Amino acid sequence: MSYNYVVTAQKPTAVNGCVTGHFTSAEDLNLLIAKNTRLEIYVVTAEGLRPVKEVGMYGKIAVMELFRPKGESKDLLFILTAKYNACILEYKQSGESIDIITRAHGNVQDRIGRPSETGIIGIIDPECRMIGLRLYDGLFKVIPLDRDNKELKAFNIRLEELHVIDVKFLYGCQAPTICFVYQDPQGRHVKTYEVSLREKEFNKGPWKQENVEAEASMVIAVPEPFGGAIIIGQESITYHNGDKYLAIAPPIIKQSTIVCHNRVDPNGSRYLLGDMEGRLFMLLLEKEEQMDGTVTLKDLRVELLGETSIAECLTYLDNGVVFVGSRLGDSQLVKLNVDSNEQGSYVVAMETFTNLGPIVDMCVVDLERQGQGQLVTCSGAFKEGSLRIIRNGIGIHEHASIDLPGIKGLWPLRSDPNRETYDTLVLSFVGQTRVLMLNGEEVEETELMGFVDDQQTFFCGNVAHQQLIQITSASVRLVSQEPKALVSEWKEPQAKNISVASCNSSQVVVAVGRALYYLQIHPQELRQISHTEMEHEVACLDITPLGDSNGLSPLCAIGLWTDISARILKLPSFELLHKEMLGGEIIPRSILMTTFESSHYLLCALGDGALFYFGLNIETGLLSDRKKVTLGTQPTVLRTFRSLSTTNVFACSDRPTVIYSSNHKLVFSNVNLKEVNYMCPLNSDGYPDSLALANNSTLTIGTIDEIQKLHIRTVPLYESPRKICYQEVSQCFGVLSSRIEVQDTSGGTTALRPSASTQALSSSVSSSKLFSSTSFGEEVEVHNLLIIDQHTFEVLHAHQFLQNEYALSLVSCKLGKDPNTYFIVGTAMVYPEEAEPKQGRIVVFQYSDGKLQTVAEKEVKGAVYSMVEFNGKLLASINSTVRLYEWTTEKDVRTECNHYNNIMALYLKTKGDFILVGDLMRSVLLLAYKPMEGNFEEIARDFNPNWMSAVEILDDDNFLGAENAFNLFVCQKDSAATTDEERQHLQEVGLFHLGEFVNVFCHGSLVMQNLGSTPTQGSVLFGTVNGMIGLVTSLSESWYNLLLDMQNRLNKVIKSVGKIEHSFWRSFHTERKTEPATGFIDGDLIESFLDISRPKMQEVVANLQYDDGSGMKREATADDLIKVVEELTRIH
Amino acid sequence: LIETGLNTVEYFTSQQVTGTSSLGKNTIPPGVTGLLTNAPKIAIVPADDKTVPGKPIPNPLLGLDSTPSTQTVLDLSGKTLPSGSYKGVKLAKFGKENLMTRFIEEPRENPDFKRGRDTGGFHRREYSIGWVGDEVKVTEWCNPSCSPITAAARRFECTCHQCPVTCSECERDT
Ligand SMILES: [Zn+2]
Ligand SMILES: [Zn+2]
């Protein structure tokens, strides 16, 4: 029935957890970071973080603790998945090969049991005698640690307290004891219990203390020295050691809640505290050396340190360095200084780590303008709020820029016969040549005895016999090095000027109109081996020596003027070996011979921005598999260079492109630069492994980014972005936003910091009177509609909404016969006393210019969660209703029809006269607008209940849905159109567990397509709470089946990190049902195929009947699958 | 334990920021009162009151007649589409979970108990809930501010002369 594909375009960036210890080696400080499904391992050092190994798991990491059982050389790792997959991991490294082996594993799920609020707690005993798991209320799961229990057997000790807040094991306890915080009728208390592995019960423990603060939320076991625990709350931080009891109440807390903490000293003394607003604190414990015997805890104080990103995770490394793991904003590496500098902060950020999550909304846009998408998102929240621009391409780091206009070419050069680095850069101009010398980082004019400067150079560089060559329009000059001077020169027999110039280390082929001359480079002499007259004006030349040959090309690639041809010629005799008649109007600009992986090709570029590429046989010289792409519009110049190992071609033009090979398939990658007229590799000591680039006015040296990667441009907002549109005509984006302002005695509400809405250029406030018939300390939400510039992204205009009015939906569009393009917002009057809005409105603005204009207004009796432009009309959902409004000539929106069969219509998507509705709990429904009738008709709905979160239309018959339990699904309109009941239903044909919470779906692609053919159809990108960006397409039953087989084979061979089965992981799953995936294939699995050994590769293919298209079956080879998957990787 | 839920939009909002749903929690929606106590905000209430006229509301389960009212059906086990009104479905759950079957909610514009004339001129929303395993049914209707709130569930008439006939919540009821 259904055939979909799902690949990760961007791995989750939000940090869910981060622990620290000695995992890689007992004498190494490791930093383990949990994204969601990703596990990153580092080594802490001087520079700080050294990436060691990164892996994935088939599940969401919920618990992650390092620990050390007696008898282990280094630490072991504990991990519990959200689907309850448990395991103990060991870091084992033999050679350049690293593996994370499994010492034990099992699924600790219970058949019944209520998942506790405050979720899964996973703690480990200090003695390493056992693991404690609070998975369900009233139950505490225990797992013994005998090197015997590898299947992770466990028992459930009952717990009276049915509502635990937090739990930790205590230190210095002959018997493992649990100290937690709970809440019953009497309030919140904190008791203890001992855990006996023997009897398998829980007795009664050391101490008890009823009624701690009502907001007591964290527990902390203080180490050996002090023993006992600490309890963090709202203004209440207390110590409890049986008989001891301390209690401070720093007003510094009061403001925000302390959510995370970390022990700085192995003994207690210092701890880090994390505020919910980003405040970093320090908790100190004053140790009192009695005089003789033992040591008590005299006192404890709190000290503000500074501001960081809103922290989720907090880990102290060493030498005053701390890693701040964020979920709402970028994560960071911070240094704690002894002295609080200006303003008063010991906190100074070192490194900032991009985080796109949460992604609340997004839109695809061709900003730069030319067939390449780009994602603009509403990421983060609160103070960490922001916009992100995500683009594909290769990046270059500019290292110098000189104002040299008119550069007509440039070549790298070795001035010192002995040194192997470049130290000179030759520049060409209309009629001269200028030689720049390279001193470290300094570049300055210089002369080179043998070279002429009053002529244009067509080529120059190092050649055979410690010689140097310079070919100008006037002649080709051979220059000595150590002796240094002109030691030979060639010129056409009649002084005619050289028109085209090709040249490698030992040979030269220049053209004088139609005349071709083959010369060879020998000591102190240039030898003219031959010559010929081409049937037409020569346009371009290449004699690049390919193959294991030795600097002597047997072939000569030439491009002609008249018949717009590219032809191969045997070098000695200029004998024709192949004449490829191409293009038609424009002549070839550039032509080059090169090798990409193992194969040789011929590239030829027209003045069209058009590029032809053939397979080349360097023996026979015949061109094969003629292909064509469009790299732009200006003529294109081809040049070769070697990034790291391999070698690629740099294509200079208005659309700069790096051409290379992946798995035998060429790759055209766009460079993130404006326009490049000429390029050349430059490898000096000052500019190691670099590129010398040149446009129409400036020289520029920098270095290429190895290979392509999404680049993330970010725009701070300092407040929460909620929705976003794009208005072409206005050249800008419309963004819904909210900020936190607290009530103030001075009549209204102030704020907490400057933000995009406040520090705006223009500004305005709602003047509406439609409605008008907290304490002080309470927080209040204020919404705004920002108008950000497409190019500068500065906030042009900001607009405030009525007090208490939340803006929930946005949309840029035209309506009726109205010529103008408005910005339309849907809202809701939110009062805490109501369970759901009863009032709201649809405001219609316009940014005709300079400022925003409030054109119209329309009252509504509920929240306008979603709205979409619909065939000139405006579709919108209010609460339980779906309404279609018309736009008169009198500029008013007026109801035509409605649909009321919903609990709460949150999401809306349109295609034609069909409409897709996403409801709180009645999953998707399909409506159709009946024109003649003037209202709506229910076509079909999904009869399975589903708490939606996002929705999308893959095509007329298939609808994609994201649900609140991290699952994706597809519903289809039954094909058995033989009954009005069968059409009424839409079968769930696709089920897949994503393990990601989805907020937005939107047709689009971050990949080019103007490049002159896809195994997939469609392209829906999607945003995630973890900052993860995915893609979804459609396959033919053919490909699906192959890939489904592929998966099952691969699963037999891929070593799964925690011994978790891929099929378990991808099984649709909720607190209700659990089913096997179907209709879905994850390309993450399929793409991991290209990363295993041929042996394993050959095993995966073993005994597989494969159809290479020949319709004639054959035994499948690894290369068949390589070709298949390589094609698949190109959809993103 | 009983906690007051959170206005939908507050839930809508924060869920796009934090993947956590927040469902699993013994909450009662804001503005609703647990009209059951024979002899948060629950409120103790008299079983009945023959003092004021008014036809009783038939048991929900019995799936009988009550026309000016809205019917809600909720299946705790999933497998069947829920139907009715947001609040109907919300209370149905909170109702099954706690042993409660009567609920009241008086709109914003309204100043213990003594409802009658002083508090008349509007409508007060009632809720009746039935069990039957995993299957939970609810009948919801509108009552005059005039009216008395009791454990018994009837459709009282009006004592005040100001109390209205249809509200904007009383429509589409059948
Ligand atoms: Zn009345
Ligand atoms: Zn009513």
SS (H, E, C) A983-1029: CCEEEEEEEEECCCCEEEEEECCCCCCCCCCCCCEEEEEEEECCCCE
What percent of the residues of chain B are helix, what percent strand, and what percent coil, each to the nearest 5? 15, 25, 65
Burial state string for A1052-1084 with b = 16 or more CB within 10 A and e = fewer than 16: eebebbbebebebbbbbbbeeeeeebbbbbbbe
Q: Parallel, antiparallel, or unpaired for β A967-973 and A986-993?
A: antiparallel
Residue A828 at interface with chain B, using a CB cutoff of 8 Å: yes
Q: A943: which residues sit within 8 A by CB, 6+ positions away?
A: A985, B80, B81
Q: What is the distance between the alpha carbons of residues A841 and A945, in angstroms, rounded to a whole number?
A: 30
Q: What is the distance between the alpha carbons of residues A970 and A952, in angstroms, rounded to a whole number?
A: 10
Q: Which CATH entry fits the domain spanning A1-14+356-392+710-1034: 3.40.250.10, 3.40.50.970, 3.40.50.720, 2.130.10.10? A: 2.130.10.10
Q: What is the distance between the alpha carbons of residues A601 and A731, in angstroms, rounded to a whole number?
A: 43
Domain A1035-1132 has CATH 1.10.287.110: no
Question: A837: distance to nearest CA of chain B, Å?
Answer: 8
Q: Residue B61, SS3? A: coil
Q: What is the distance between the alpha carbons of residues B104 and A395, in angstroms, rounded to a whole number?
A: 63
Amino acid at the residue A547:
G
Q: What is the distance between the alpha carbons of residues A488 and A526, in angstroms, rounded to a whole number?
A: 6
What backbone torsions phi and psi does residue A784 show, to the nearest 5 degrees?
Answer: -140, 160
Q: Half-sphere exposure of residue A933, counting CA atoms within 13 Å on the CB side?
A: 9
Question: A1025: distance to nearest CA of chain B, Å?
Answer: 6
Amino acid at the residue A453:
D
> Are A897 and A936 within 8 A, CB to CB?
yes
> Are A839 and A772 within 8 A, CB to CB?
no
Tokens standing for residue A358: 């949460």
Q: What is the DSSP string of A625-691?
A: EEEEEE--SS--EEEEE-SSSS-EEEEESSS-EEEEESSSSEEEEEBSSS--SEEEEE--SSSTTEE
Q: What is the distance between the alpha carbons of residues A156 and A1013, in angstroms, rounded to a whole number?
A: 57
CATH topology of domain A15-355: Methylamine Dehydrogenase; Chain H (2.130.10)
For an interface test with A, the pick among B4, B22, B81 (most A C-beta atoms closer than 10 Å) comes out as: B81
Q: A122: which residues sit within 8 A by CB, 6+ positions away?
A: A62, A63, A65, A78, A80, A131, A132, A133, A134
A-B CB pairs within 8 A amount to 110
Tokens standing for residue A95: 């050679």
How many CB atoms lie under 10 A from the CB of residue A292?
5
- What spacing in Å lies between the alpha carbon of B166 and ligand 2's midpoint? 5
Residues in chain A: 1132
Amino acid at the residue A268:
G
The CATH class that applies to domain A393-709 reads mainly beta
> Are A287 and A305 within 8 A, CB to CB?
no
Experimental determination approach used: X-ray
Identify the nearest ligand to the CA of B52 by its number. 1
> Are B141 and B150 within 8 A, CB to CB?
no
Q: Which of A504, A503, A507, A512 is nearest to A529 (CA)?
A: A507
Q: Residue A1095, SS3? A: helix
Q: Which of A660, A185, A593, A10 is nearest to A394 (CA)?
A: A660
> Are B24 and A117 within 8 A, CB to CB?
yes
Residue A605 at interface with chain B, using a CB cutoff of 8 Å: no
Q: Which of A974, A959, A991 is nearest to A1069 (CA)?
A: A991
> Are A550 and A622 within 8 A, CB to CB?
no
Does A15-355 match A1035-1132 in CATH topology?
no
Look at B24 and A114 and tell me if their CB atoms are within 8 Å: yes
Terminal alpha carbon distance of chain B: 35
Q: What is the distance between the alpha carbons of residues A169 and A91, in angstroms, rounded to a whole number?
A: 25
Beta bridge partners of residue A1030, listed in sequence order: A8, A1022
Q: What is the distance between the alpha carbons of residues A540 and A1130, in angstroms, rounded to a whole number?
A: 32
Question: B51: distance to nearest CA of chain A, Å?
Answer: 31
Q: Parallel, antiparallel, or unpaired for β B27-28 and B3-4?
A: parallel
Q: Is the peptide bond before A358 cis (omega within 30 degrees of 0)?
A: yes
Q: What is the distance between the alpha carbons of residues A382 and A21, in angstroms, rounded to a whole number?
A: 32
Which 1079-1108 residues of chain A touch chain B by CB within 8 A?
Answer: none
Residue B15 at interface with chain A, using a CB cutoff of 8 Å: yes
Q: Note every long-range contact of A215-219, with CB atoms under 8 Å and residues 24 or more positions apart, other chains counting.
A: A215/A257, A216/A165, A216/A181, A216/A188, A216/A190, A217/A165, A217/A166, A217/A181, A217/A257, A217/A258, A218/A166, A218/A258, A218/A261, A219/A165, A219/A166, A219/A167, A219/A168, A219/A179, A219/A180, A219/A181, A219/A190
For an interface test with A, the pick among B2, B17, B172 (most A C-beta atoms closer than 10 Å) comes out as: B17
> Are A951 and A1011 within 8 A, CB to CB?
no
E strand or H helix that includes residue A1094: helix A1094-1101
Q: Which of A562, A671, A642, A557 is nearest to A603 (CA)?
A: A557
Residues in chain B: 174
Sign of the CA dihedral running A352, A357, A359, A365: positive
Strands, E assignment, A83-200: 85-93, 98-107, 121-124, 130-134, 139-144, 155-158, 164-169, 177-184, 187-196
Tokens standing for residue A845: 């603005």
Domain ranges of chain B: 1-174
Domain ranges of chain A: 1-14+356-392+710-1034, 15-355, 393-709, 1035-1132
HEC per residue, A881-939? CEEEEEECCCCCEEEEEEECCCCCEEEEEEECCEEEEEECCCCEEEEEEECCCCEEEEE
* Alpha-carbon dihedral B57, B63, B64, B65, rounded to 10 degrees: 70
What is each CA distance from A223 to A25, A226, A890, B167, in whole angstroms? 23, 6, 75, 65
> Are A945 and A930 within 8 A, CB to CB?
no
What is each CA distance from A876 to A140, A833, A954, in whole angstroms? 48, 25, 21
Tokens standing for residue A279: 């405040």
Of B7, B25, B80, the CB nearest to A836: B7
Residue A381 at interface with chain B, using a CB cutoff of 8 Å: yes
DSSP A170: P
- What spacing in Å lies between the alpha carbon of B123 and ligand 2's midpoint? 6
* Alpha-carbon dihedral A1097, A1101, A1106, A1109, rounded to 10 degrees: 0
Q: A185: which residues sit within 8 A by CB, 6+ positions away?
A: none
Look at A966 and B19 and tell me if their CB atoms are within 8 Å: yes
Look at B10 and A832 and tell me if their CB atoms are within 8 Å: yes
- What spacing in Å lies between the alpha carbon of B121 and ligand 1's midpoint? 5
Residues of B in contact with A922 (CB under 8 A): 81-83
